[PDB]
Design a protein around this motif. Structure first.
Motif, short mmCIF file in Angstrom:
data_model
loop_
_atom_site.label_atom_id
_atom_site.label_comp_id
_atom_site.label_asym_id
_atom_site.label_seq_id
_atom_site.Cartn_x
_atom_site.Cartn_y
_atom_site.Cartn_z
N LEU A 45 3.92 7.76 1.68
CA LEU A 45 3.53 6.74 3.00
C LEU A 45 3.37 5.30 2.10
CD1 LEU A 45 3.01 6.95 5.72
CD2 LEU A 45 3.18 9.05 4.47
N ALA A 46 4.16 4.33 2.77
CA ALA A 46 4.26 2.95 2.08
C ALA A 46 3.85 2.02 3.25
CB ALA A 46 5.66 2.51 1.59
N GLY A 47 3.28 0.94 2.67
CA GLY A 47 3.25 -0.42 3.51
C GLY A 47 4.27 -1.51 3.06
N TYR A 48 4.43 -2.29 4.16
CA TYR A 48 5.19 -3.43 3.95
C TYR A 48 4.86 -4.57 4.54
CZ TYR A 48 9.51 -1.36 1.76
OH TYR A 48 10.43 -0.66 1.15
N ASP A 49 5.20 -5.90 4.10
CA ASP A 49 4.89 -7.10 4.48
C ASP A 49 5.16 -7.23 6.27
OD1 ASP A 49 4.17 -7.74 1.81
OD2 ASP A 49 6.16 -8.57 1.49
N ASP A 50 6.23 -6.89 6.55
CA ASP A 50 6.75 -7.13 7.92
C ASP A 50 5.96 -6.01 8.91
OD1 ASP A 50 8.49 -5.35 6.80
OD2 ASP A 50 10.17 -5.99 8.15
N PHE A 51 5.03 -5.16 8.43
CA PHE A 51 4.61 -4.17 9.14
C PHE A 51 5.58 -3.04 9.33
N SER A 108 0.83 -1.13 -0.01
CA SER A 108 0.00 0.05 0.14
C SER A 108 0.65 1.21 -0.12
CB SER A 108 -0.95 -0.02 1.22
OG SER A 108 -1.84 1.08 1.06
N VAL A 109 0.75 2.09 -0.94
CA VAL A 109 1.29 3.27 -1.00
C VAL A 109 0.28 4.56 -1.29
CG1 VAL A 109 3.00 4.77 -2.42
CG2 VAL A 109 3.35 2.34 -2.15
N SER A 110 0.52 5.55 -0.43
CA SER A 110 -0.32 6.59 -0.64
C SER A 110 0.70 8.13 -0.27
CB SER A 110 -1.25 6.82 0.86
OG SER A 110 -2.19 7.72 0.51
N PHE A 111 0.01 9.10 -0.70
CA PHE A 111 0.93 10.42 -0.90
C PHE A 111 0.26 11.25 0.28
CE2 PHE A 111 1.87 9.86 -5.51
CZ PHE A 111 3.23 9.75 -5.41
N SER A 112 1.33 11.92 1.09
CA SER A 112 1.11 13.01 1.79
C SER A 112 0.78 14.18 1.19
CB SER A 112 2.22 13.31 2.78
OG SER A 112 2.08 14.20 3.79
N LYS A 113 -0.08 15.37 1.84
CA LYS A 113 -0.23 16.37 1.35
C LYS A 113 1.18 17.16 1.07
CE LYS A 113 -3.93 19.92 1.75
NZ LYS A 113 -4.72 20.69 2.40
N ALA A 128 14.67 10.74 -2.49
CA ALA A 128 14.55 9.21 -2.13
C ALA A 128 15.27 8.92 -0.83
CB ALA A 128 14.59 8.48 -3.47
N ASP A 129 14.89 9.52 0.33
CA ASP A 129 15.49 9.21 1.39
C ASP A 129 14.53 8.65 2.48
OD1 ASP A 129 17.94 10.43 -0.11
OD2 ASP A 129 17.13 12.38 0.89
N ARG A 130 14.85 7.91 3.32
CA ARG A 130 14.11 7.22 4.43
C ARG A 130 13.75 8.34 5.37
NH1 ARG A 130 13.58 1.66 6.03
NH2 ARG A 130 15.58 1.50 5.00
N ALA A 131 12.35 8.34 5.70
CA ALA A 131 11.99 9.40 6.51
C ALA A 131 11.12 8.86 7.63
CB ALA A 131 11.16 10.48 5.74
N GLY A 132 10.36 7.88 7.50
CA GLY A 132 9.69 7.26 8.56
C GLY A 132 9.91 5.81 8.80
#
Lengths: 31, 219, 335, 55
Positions: free
Chosen positions: C281-287, C270-275, C297-301
């Motif tokens: 925002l992204a979702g992953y298999d291992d929560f 699951s991928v969604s865009f912040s305002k 393209a840098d990790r933020a959350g």
């Protein structure tokens, strides 16, 4: 345990539960 | 006082429904085409492309059998929905050894074996038993004098090119499984073989007893 | 000779697309500062479900929530003060996607039964009741969105997408061309285009009036399971099963950046865009829910608090908070 | 061969397209990001306890 170790094996016990199960299917399941 | 009353009533009703839904079970009838799914279901329903579930009314437990064969799409993409299912009621027909398919000139037995291997090999289905119903036994028993499997199959060097023995196909299906495999419950049926629902309850009781006996650690 | 001509056209169009690329993203955000390590904590946790959660959609007022579970019923929540306003039992307990109409008077569902229904949240008499069911699909339903109060867009199991109608229940347009099962669909805010993700390694644009393909993107691999549309309308993001993400721009029709981490194996669901589109925002298999800096393209959350699996997530229209679902029967809101 | 012909027609009609430079698209994205870079609660926190979730 020591004198007759042939019965000290799993499938013998598998066989015995299974029997209680299947025999307990004697009650008519659905009538 | 609207919010508190509405929330309390909804929570109470939901908890009551959850408590009442404690006794239920789910099984899937994953079978190949032309396996007589409707014919098999009708016999048990008489007495004792959408996904349709049959709510059986066995003693003290409401069984639920779901038809999943009629999908005609990818299977891995929706197979994740069924994970709590405790058994697989896989079905084959014994008359496909000589019923060659040309619509690919390969016999439907190869396709059935491939489907069985794919379904069993799934890592998700690890705590679920396997039920292997074999139907249409009469055809195999009768028409074998003109359909010897020495050429159509490579592992039937038996007596000669009559005296049908279904144990060969049984062994062929059984050998297609990993080591330390769970007990595979397979009872050969026919068009009007009534003794099948009680074979199903037998495997269900056994599938559960073995599990709980594993959980309470009694071995 | 048709296949040879198609191959020649593919080569020519690939050469033309490569030629038009003036400069990649190594020429704009060359030395922009990092956004900084940003983290959030759950403020209100929703309880009441007893099965897996596969969907979560917000309302038009950024307040209400709708969730669909495999076993149970639809629950209409009030995120500000937790109160189950409505509960709608469903005939088919195999739901895969739910939607909330912007009008605030209708809801939709559907699943393996290959039929989508519309309920009336309006209390004309009594309570919510089933109004109409739309049937005619071949494969299983995967997504549904509301264009207006009278139309709905759904994606089916077969390589088709349909624009249904609520006046009579007969589809008026059928989109075809895919070579795989469609699993995701994100409607653009322009109310004129939308994108659909198929099982084949490609995502394709679509229209709503002409009913024909306009652009294709065939530079990806494996399968695409999730897509979301950038706020502006010049782009969208596509999630994959190869633990990778990509960005596709409509006006340029190229590949901008391929999102990847130092060591990740599990895919994205699951991928969604912040305002303002600065955070993805992204979702992953291992929560291991992650936020990627769209600028560089840098990790933020690094949010990770669920039961080892996150399935669906969404971002409010006001952007105040983020709602995340999971396979475990629980819902959390991150502010 | 009908499907192949239809695919050929689709490729031919899609090939005749107008494309802008990727630099222009990146500039537009950066401009829109800077347009409301301070109008995102996840980016800039809501002042004081004005957030409804505050308790």
């Amino acid at each position: 345990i020591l004198f007759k170790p042939s019965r000290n094996t799993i499938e013998e016990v598998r066989c015995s539960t299974a029997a209680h199960a299947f025999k307990v299917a004697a009650r008519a399941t659905l009538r | 006082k609207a919010a508190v009353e509405r929330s309390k009533m909804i929570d109470r009703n939901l908890r009551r429904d959850k408590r009442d839904a404690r006794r239920e079970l789910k099984l899937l009838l994953l079978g190949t085409g032309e396996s007589g799914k409707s014919t098999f279901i009708k016999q048990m329903r008489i007495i004792h492309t959408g996904i349709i579930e049959y709510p059986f009314d066995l003693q003290s437990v409401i069984f639920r059998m779901v038809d999943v064969g009629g999908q005609r799409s990818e299977r891995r993409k929706w197979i994740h929905c069924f994970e709590n299912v405790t058994s697989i009621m896989f079905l084959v027909a014994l008359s496909e050894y000589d019923q060659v398919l040309v619509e690919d000139n390969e016999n439907r037995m190869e396709e059935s074996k491939a489907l069985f291997r794919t379904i069993i090999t799934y890592p998700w289905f690890q705590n679920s038993s396997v039920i292997l119903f074999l139907n249409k036994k009469d055809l195999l028993e009768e028409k074998i004098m003109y359909s010897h499997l020495v050429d159509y199959f490579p592992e039937y060097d038996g007596p000669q090119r009559a005296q049908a023995a279904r144990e060969f196909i049984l062994k062929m299906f059984v050998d297609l499984n990993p080591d330390s495999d769970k007990i595979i419950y397979s009872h050969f049926t026919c068009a009007t073989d009534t003794e099948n629902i009680r074979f199903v309850f037998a495997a269900v009781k056994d599938t559960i007893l073995q599990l709980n006996l594993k959980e309470y650690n009694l071995v | 000779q048709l296949r040879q001509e198609a191959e020649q056209l593919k080569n020519q169009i690939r050469d033309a697309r490569k030629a038009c690329a003036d400069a990649t993203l190594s020429q704009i955000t060359n030395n922009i500062d990092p956004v900084g390590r940003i983290q959030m904590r759950t403020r209100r946790t929703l309880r009441g479900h007893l099965a897996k959660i596969y969907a979560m959609h917000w309302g038009t007022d950024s307040r209400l929530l709708v969730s669909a579970s495999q076993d149970g019923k639809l629950i209409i929540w009030d995120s500000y003060t937790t109160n189950k306003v409505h509960a709608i039992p469903l005939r088919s307990s195999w739901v895969m996607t739910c939607a909330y109409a912007p009008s605030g008077n209708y809801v939709a569902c559907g699943g393996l039964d290959n039929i989508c229904s519309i309920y009336n949240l309006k209390t004309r008499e009594g309570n919510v009741r089933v109004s109409r069911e739309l049937a005619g699909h071949t494969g299983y339903l995967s997504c549904c969105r509301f264009l207006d109060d009278n139309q709905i867009v759904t994606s089916s199991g077969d390589t088709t997408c349909a624009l249904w109608d609520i006046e009579t229940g007969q589809q008026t347009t059928t989109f075809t061309g895919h070579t795989g099962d469609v699993m995701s669909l994100s409607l653009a805010p322009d109310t004129r285009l939308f994108v659909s993700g198929a099982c084949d390694a490609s995502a394709k644009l679509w229209d709503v009036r002409e009913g024909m393909c306009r652009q294709t993107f065939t530079g990806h691999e494996s399968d695409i399971n999730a897509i979301c549309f950038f706020p502006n309308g010049n782009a969208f993001a596509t999630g994959s099963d190869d633990a990778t993400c990509r960005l596709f721009d409509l006006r340029a029709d190229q590949e901008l950046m391929t999102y990847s981490h130092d060591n990740i194996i599990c895919g994205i669901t699951s991928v969604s865009f912040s305002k303002s589109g600065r955070l993805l925002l992204a979702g992953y298999d291992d929560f291991n829910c992650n936020v990627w800096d769209a600028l560089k393209a840098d990790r933020a959350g690094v949010l990770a608090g669920h039961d080892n699996r996150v399935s669906c997530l969404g971002v409010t229209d006001d952007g105040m908070a983020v709602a995340t679902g999971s396979w475990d029967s629980f819902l959390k809101i991150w502010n | 061969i009908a499907q192949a012909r239809k695919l050929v027609e689709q490729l031919k009609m899609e090939a005749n397209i107008d494309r802008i430079k990727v630099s222009k698209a990146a500039a537009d994205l950066m401009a829109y990001c800077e347009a409301h870079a301070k109008e995102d609660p996840l980016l800039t926190p809501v002042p004081a306890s004005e957030n409804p979730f505050r308790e």
